[PDB]
Amino acid sequence: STGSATTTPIDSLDDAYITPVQIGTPAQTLNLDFDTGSSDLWVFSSETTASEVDGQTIYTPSKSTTAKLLSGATWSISYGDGSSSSGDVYTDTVSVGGLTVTGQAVESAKKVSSSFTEDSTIDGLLGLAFSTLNTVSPTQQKTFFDNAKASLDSPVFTADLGYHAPGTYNFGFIDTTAYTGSITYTAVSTKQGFWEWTSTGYAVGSGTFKSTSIDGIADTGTTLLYLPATVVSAYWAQVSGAKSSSSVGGYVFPCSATLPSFTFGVGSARIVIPGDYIDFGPISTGSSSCFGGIQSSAGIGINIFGDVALKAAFVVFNGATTPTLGFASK
């Protein structure tokens, strides 16, 4: 089998992407944030505290003929941004882009933190990291990908995120029309439960490429590119008036600037992030200070190749016995 779904930015900044997901019988379509940095499929629901729902579409298990309470199971998750959610669990039929899994754990939120409530566009998350990170207790549950894998034509999914445009998540096949050149594959460590890999280095603008190992994760659920402070300082030093602002929470730059590109290595291959991908616009409405899309990973404890980096590539998440990542230009 295969599946193919369009993923759409939630706003004009590409802060996140939503992908429609069918849950239950008859189908309930929710728009979920596909997150290769976590492993829980959780949804706003009929169980979510009413004051914590503000415009989201909810899953109502009582209206699904295929829903079954997973008796005794609970979940609770905290993300890198300090957001959180928790609840109980149902199993149900879940379809993405025509690919159906039966008996998928659908984690029903009873509570969500304020950032989820305030984002009316995101009806929940669909985790695509390794199932070792799934938070369901006392019986850990599998991701949608892990449950689909054995049925797929090839044990892969691909992320093709757009810059200020829709993109595609495919499951079970590699669309050879979706990228240019060849795909460069690189090793993955699953030790932390992430799609963790090592970039071979970077360049700033038209500058020379610096060969250096940068371990980090491929995380579709993180908006920005978080790299070591040395790399990030080297980038922003090429932008007149850029500075790290403790008050704002990262590097800011004059909105009048033209940003340089940023290149990262994948083996001997190179992925170029255009300068405009690194512009996240005014820090507050009407400000002439703009927020940078490349930020320090200092304090976070891991480097994160988030959407800023991944949307410059066609990315293969290869879930074979020995997982690998692939990157191609596009």
Return the HEC string of 20-32: EEEECCCCEEEEE
Amino acid letter, 259? L
Rg (CA), the chain: 20
CB 34 within 8 A of CB 128: yes
Strand 225-227 versus strand 294-296 pairing type: parallel
**Which of the residues are catalytic?**
35, 199
Closest CA to 320 of 191, 222, 185: 185
Between CA 143 and CA 132 the distance in angstroms is 9
Token pair 């409405």: residue: 285
Pinpoint the alpha helices (H) of the chain.
114-118, 144-148, 229-236, 307-310
And the tokens for 101? Answer: 């899994």
- Specify the 3-state DSSP secondary structure of 283: coil
Method used experimentally: X-ray
Amino acid letter, 76? S
Between CA 214 and CA 204 the distance in angstroms is 15
Between CA 105 and CA 77 the distance in angstroms is 15
- Output the CA torsion sign for 79, 83, 88, 94: negative
- Specify the 3-state DSSP secondary structure of 318: strand
Please tell me the CATH superfamily of domain 175-330, with its number.
Acid Proteases (2.40.70.10)
Token pair 């829903």: residue: 67
Token pair 């507050």: residue: 284
How many CB atoms neighbour CB 204 within 10 A?
20
Between CA 313 and CA 304 the distance in angstroms is 15
User: Residue 55: exposed, middle, or buried by beta-carbon count in 10 A (0-12, 13-18, 19+)?
Assistant: exposed
Strand 28-35 versus strand 17-23 pairing type: antiparallel
Find the Cα–Cα–Cα–Cα dihedral 34, 25, 90, 222, rounded to 10°: 10
CB 304 within 8 A of CB 222: yes
CB 243 within 8 A of CB 251: yes
Resolution in A: 1.0
Between CA 131 and CA 215 the distance in angstroms is 21
And the tokens for 197? Answer: 């890999």
Write the CB contacts of 58 (distance below 8 Å, at least 6 apart in sequence).
30, 43, 44, 45, 46, 48, 123
Strand 167-171 versus strand 225-227 pairing type: unpaired
And the tokens for 198? Answer: 């090592």
Letter string b/e over residues 173-183, b meaning 16 or more CB atoms within 10 A of that residue's CB: bbeeeebeeeb
Between CA 184 and CA 271 the distance in angstroms is 10
DSSP class of 201: E
Between CA 257 and CA 290 the distance in angstroms is 9
Between CA 98 and CA 102 the distance in angstroms is 13
The answer to whether 5-174 and 175-330 have equal CATH topology is yes
Closest CA to 59 of 38, 39, 99, 87: 87
| Half-sphere exposure (Cβ direction) of 27: Cα atoms closer than 13 Å | 13
Between CA 32 and CA 319 the distance in angstroms is 21
- Domain 5-174, what architecture? Beta Barrel (2.40)
CB 160 within 8 A of CB 330: yes
Write the CB contacts of 323 (distance below 8 Å, at least 6 apart in sequence).
188, 190, 195, 317
Angstrom distances, CA of residue 214 to CA of 124, 218, 224, 229, 263: 31, 12, 16, 12, 13
Q: Domain ranges for the chain, please list them.
A: 5-174, 175-330
And the tokens for 318? Answer: 């290869």
Between CA 285 and CA 278 the distance in angstroms is 18
